[model samples]
Target chain A: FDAVTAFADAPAAVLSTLNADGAPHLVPVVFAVHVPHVEGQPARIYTAVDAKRKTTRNLRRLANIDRDSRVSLLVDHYSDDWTQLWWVRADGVATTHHSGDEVATGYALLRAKYHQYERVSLDGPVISVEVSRWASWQA
Target chain B: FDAVTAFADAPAAVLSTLNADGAPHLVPVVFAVHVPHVEGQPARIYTAVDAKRKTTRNLRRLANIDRDSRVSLLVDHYSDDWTQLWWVRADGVATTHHSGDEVATGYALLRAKYHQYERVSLDGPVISVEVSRWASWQA
Candidate 1:
């Protein structure tokens, strides 16, 4: 899958967080694609905080976030046949987001670009990040 | 690095088991890595039960293991480059161990193969599974 399309078309990601105790927590997070201010800028993303989301309750990796922001995550579609397998790994930095519709605007861009994604009236408390270094390979 | 060696060389995977309040509890696990069966079969792994190791701790995942063995885990690693890029993911099916000596032998193999693994001994609880679907990508 194209990284741009996947980032645009795919409306969600597995947001793996840490509990206060330093254990890994994985949750699916639906987000909007943010376009940077310059020409050909990389994809920026935003997600409003859900008080009920797993990330809010567990806050597991909070402490480590400052010390180590490097994380490895993948977007993959698998099948019984390995040859048909396709995946993308994103190794980058993550920063947090506060509340609002400034994030909703980013969501609007994503919804406009990808017909597959449902456009909704997004809320506040979103976490936003600019992807720094990116490379995608498949096996 | 070879996937097998990578898995073997890892420090205790920061396993996040659920607690009573629907939160997560972090724990260090020295689960076992089994020998590949029947000359050419892929390697299998195993984790044990122990009183001192907090097996009695009630976590939603552990509790469900008895009735239904569906378990999801993260086995991750990283690159040594400047980015300090990392990946976290896992795949394996859980199984029950019948004899302690059998468990001992498995632990010995794990210890002998990975000499650098801290405290990889016969005393702790071990969990083993044959990895099925592995998903990992650097961030």
Candidate 2:
């Protein structure tokens, strides 16, 4: 599959946010690729603080993005067959949404992608990332 | 399972290096989790620039780590069963190795983890990330 196809089909991705010391802070995220319903617009990504146990209550992702909007994310397809291996990456600027239509849109979009989201309410925070570039590699 | 178990069992991971602008330069990588047998030393990650095609010949990962050693990488387990979803992340300072015992060790380690490496001779650059922190999350 092509990059976008794999990006949409993959179940999960990892997001990178810049820490105060300029270190890359990596975290796994389950997200929705929010492409517009109408004509063509660049895909925006949506992920939320859903009901999951975290290593710490202080969300480092939120803090990092707040300080630096520049971020990158990657989703990969793996197989025993290396030739079938592929990954799609996106670099984007992200903003944290607290209360608004985008937050709900992000929640609904994620629920649409993952059926498990139907069970929980995403009341914490929603992240909206506007993709600037999409890159991929295939083995 | 725990973070170390998940990190070892994962087929692949994403490596993050800090770009000059402090943006994360993200890339998907096939890596070996090198935990020593003696049991005291920290687990270091090894990844290589192999025969796989690249978007550009100049490797940003190599340059990024060269300019800034601060990096982070993440591996995730995804499932339709949200209860089974988990991810492990490590923050580290990475150094690039060209040709040495550790380079051969890294190559051998990765070859043991993925049979794909057996077909290609890893004469290219190798990255050794000495992990400073290992963090995990569960759903």
Candidate 3:
């Protein structure tokens, strides 16, 4: 299966980044995937800190990314029919962009993908993940 | 929403464990959640290595647990209806039980939860995670 396409189509992806103590910090991100037009470029994933009310405005995921770029993302399909189950995984290096072209492009990519962002701009930070390995599984 | 109930109801969960290098190793596991009848006991999660075909037999998750027991599990509800979006998270300390009463009880719990396991018993290491914290979010 085309893991990239499967990942891009999913409504959300669980992002796993390492905390300072080497423990895994997990969160589900609404994201957009950009496959660069360049022939050999890897797919770039974009997600950002948003206005979603949380326990705190300071996002742990962003801090985790700043401390360590290594991340693992998972997108899965679930169904009552057991044979239809499938999942896609990506392990990659991620960077958080607060400003500049990368942030704008990331915001634009996410904005166009999600209507929620149309009114509520991504005022925090944008994250870009360049996948190093893409894998998939089916049941 | 009851995070424990939601976590238990989900058919699959993404388990994040720390690699030796502190990077996150992620996998989707079909699991069962056990909430002991004892008033103050924490909920325990159970999952094991099965006969599911994979890239390799040696499990990285099991190894990660051995090196460091910290793990984060995430289960989210997605929908075309945005109002229904929600997620439950559990951060826990896990241990691998090779053989004992815990393993037997874990196996019985899983066998009852999944019909797939009725035929293919969990022959490899069984993981039991005692959740330290339970958290949730709704959109």
Candidate 4:
């Protein structure tokens, strides 16, 4: 689970997902590692999906999550006169969080910490990735 | 268009576009200042679209291309030394070139250069982006 630290704790990253047509879809997301429910989960970032969010509505990527559980997440930090970057590939099986489970609690914590749900409607669905393969590189 | 050279042409840049839901889509694209068309006639870039490529096709950011045409093409390059970096942001408009007299010649040139499209469909669609503004920063 600790295969990739760059993605697990990056302050900012863009989530690249496939649209229904197998085209590339990039979305910015703030992710953090550590999901209390999934034991031994190394670095798990939590993101929520709702009805309004296109990433959530695109069911094709979600349905096929198990088939190709691989995701490329990048973490970059920059400043004047200097630059640093880290890329991580997280491969894991994701399960849509059910009601009243640890997954839901984890999401709730994420929302509370980031206040992500303040404006977003949580009426739709959510996903939790229990990672299997995680690898990171910085160059 | 030469003003774009202010941001050293690099490989990793933040490509920002608007989503249909009016959200900001930020991702990394190979960055360089190349005229989508011939020099002097505004510039553009070629992008493809497929069902899986949601961001490329039928995008809401595309709507503004014909209207405002203002887009921010950013570049953030980082090395492994943990030092921050010099980043550049190109604030420009998107000029789309789908067809014209130069279409045939341009495709031929591209096919010859890349070699991947040796047998490209001549009738294939190409989206060329004409940049209007270029901005850069060491930060």
Native-referenced TM-scores of chain A, all candidate models: 0.63, 0.89, 0.90, 0.60
Evaluate model 3: give its lDDT.
0.83
lDDT of 1 by residue, B65-102 (tens): 44433333544433323134444445445554445765
- Model 1: residues with Cα > 4 Å off, grouped in runs: A18-22, A35-40, A51-72, A100-102, A110-121, B1-139
Question: Each model's DockQ?
Answer: 0.05, 0.85, 0.75, 0.05
Per-residue CA lDDT of candidate 4, range B48-122, in tens? 322123335434334544444444555544433223434445545555455674454456545543433444344
**lDDT tens string, model 2, B1-139?**
5788789778888888887787888887788988878867888999888535563523777778899998888888887887887888988989899889778989888888887767766777789989888998887
Docking class of 3: medium
Which one is best on lDDT? 3
Residue B25 lDDT, candidate 2, scale 0-100 = 85
Per-residue accuracy of model 2 over A1-139 as CA lDDT, tens digit each: 5677679777788888888877888888889997666847778999997433355464778888889899898987788887787778989999999889989899888888888767756677889999998988887
Residue A130 lDDT, candidate 2, scale 0-100: 91
After best superposition, candidate 4 residue B52: deviation in angstroms?
Answer: 33
Ranking of candidates on lDDT, top first: 3, 2, 1, 4
Residue-wise lDDT of candidate 3 within B1-139, one digit each (tens)? 7778988988888899988987888788888899988968998998887533355654778778889999999998887666789888889999988889778878888888888776654777688999988888887
Which has the greatest DockQ? 2
A67-115 in candidate 4: lDDT tens per residue? 4444434454432222244445544445555455645665665666555
- Candidate 4's TM-score reads 0.44
Candidates 3 and 4 compared by TM-score, better number: 3
